[PDB]
Point group: D2
Chain length 168, copies 4
Amino acid sequence: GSQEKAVVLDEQAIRRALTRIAHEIIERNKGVDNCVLVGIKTRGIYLAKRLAERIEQIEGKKVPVGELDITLYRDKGTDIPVDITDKKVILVDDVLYTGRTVRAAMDALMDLGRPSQIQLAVLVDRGHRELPIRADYVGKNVPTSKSERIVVQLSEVDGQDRVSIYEK
Amino acid sequence: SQEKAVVLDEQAIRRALTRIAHEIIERNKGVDNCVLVGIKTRGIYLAKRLAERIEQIEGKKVPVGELDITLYKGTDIPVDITDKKVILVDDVLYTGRTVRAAMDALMDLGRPSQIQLAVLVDRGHRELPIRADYVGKNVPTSKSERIVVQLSEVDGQDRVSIYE
Amino acid sequence: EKAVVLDEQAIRRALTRIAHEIIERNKGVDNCVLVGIKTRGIYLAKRLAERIEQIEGKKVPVGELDITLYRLVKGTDIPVDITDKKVILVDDVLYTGRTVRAAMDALMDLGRPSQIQLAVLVDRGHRELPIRADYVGKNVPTSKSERIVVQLSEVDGQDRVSIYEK
Amino acid sequence: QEKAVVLDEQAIRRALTRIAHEIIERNKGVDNCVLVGIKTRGIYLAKRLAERIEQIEGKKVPVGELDITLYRDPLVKGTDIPVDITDKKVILVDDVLYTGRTVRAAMDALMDLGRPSQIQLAVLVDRGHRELPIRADYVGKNVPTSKSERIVVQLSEVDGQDRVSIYEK
């Protein structure tokens, strides 16, 4: 839809969620040795870069960031600067809806290499999964109806940081 | 390896599977356009048990298919799965790599409208972002343990244990 | 009325599922007592006792608590001693958790149960206390300007759960 | 004796830092929040969290204390909360959540002192086996245990080291 129904994360809430996710990643992996962030185009890639910056500030370690170009089911090229074999790949996307985009991303990764794990971080989980896929790290669970959509704006691409529900 | 604990006896297995049958009916609002697909030997028997239980509850026969997948390939699914809700059934969810392969096989056969996952045991230690929709029992384990699932059809008794 | 979130078949499927969860988690229903929070919680409890009986061939005793719903304990009517029993408290909707907090305190005045479990048809979010249901029919997202209305046939003439802007 | 270490010192630090960020996130800052620790180790965890939150947000959250016999091993012995909690968000802090009986008693004590807007719960460890419908909002680690085990939390301020272990007993 075209009408903003609710703002569900403002700029500050986005920052607080990403910071908390960074801390989770570090906590669950016990540091970030052998981790690679891989963002899904376009907004996922910017979120991955933000997480890498935050992690570097927290831990003093640089996590490499790769990119996947995938058509988003919700609405097939690769650029990963390190070998992912035996690494822990943390996929990053803005919104988890059906899970079909993540399924395709997993398949791509598993063609490029044999990671030891693939984790998933998303800014929003909006429900309505169609595959048995779940994010390891979630910024905000945002309930939605099927007629609603999530709009993520990020300052790098869109001029402001905002997440909204839009409705017809 | 020695047995370290028993985590589900025969009655607990029966209770978990009956509850899972009721969850499947509940979440899908009936079982129209659903298809159960069992993974490997024990997932297939669990799928059959769930189909029999669902038939008794709802009076509808859900088709049961099979997938043969190597242990972390062949398929036998008796209906078209395009636009159907496929409920994959496995005995244990560990890394998620078997399920990832199973999803691949399914997508090769057809275009299901969704894929759900039912397991008797989730033992943690996922290596992919895969979760079961329906779980009999969450069984915490260390990496130096394994789950052993016995089902009467092939093993003589219904039991789940931790070994190692 | 904004959205019907459970119709009659969905209510039946949720309560049947909850009965099987209760039997599963308790490994049967020996030494269990259902206690409903008046009025709709009491009918839900009775439905659950009827389902459990069909499954297990045991009739779980059903008690009642009369409590002002935050969304004060006025009276209790529990037909068995609850000391060393597993009490399953039943309400229609979990919102803040303040009512359940008051119910727990009442129960603990009437006896020393081994445990207190909580079954609710709907969890609408917005907790204000660290209270969670063990058994939930449906998680129903709501805003603070909305309310959940539950109708059960025995006392309200139909089975329906809706969100109202109220 | 000791069966397994489940959080070492670095894992305790990382959990508490993460929890501080969760507290800030969920409450959108820490305005009108009050941390209340359960003795003996919950209070030190509350003070750690307050120090972390001050570093992150620049703001000092007041810390109170509750002295309660711990069911896991309830009587409310005493309270010492330095601000009024009416209409505030109280974040109760304990080291281990087991049956929930202690928290139940803590909630009662809080309600005797004031009318908080909400009561949140942070614990370092949730070891399962609840006997009441109580759950923590913030958890350091979910630690599966059997009924024949206990959790032992050591904190440097009380015990001379930071460690969480499972013991047979």
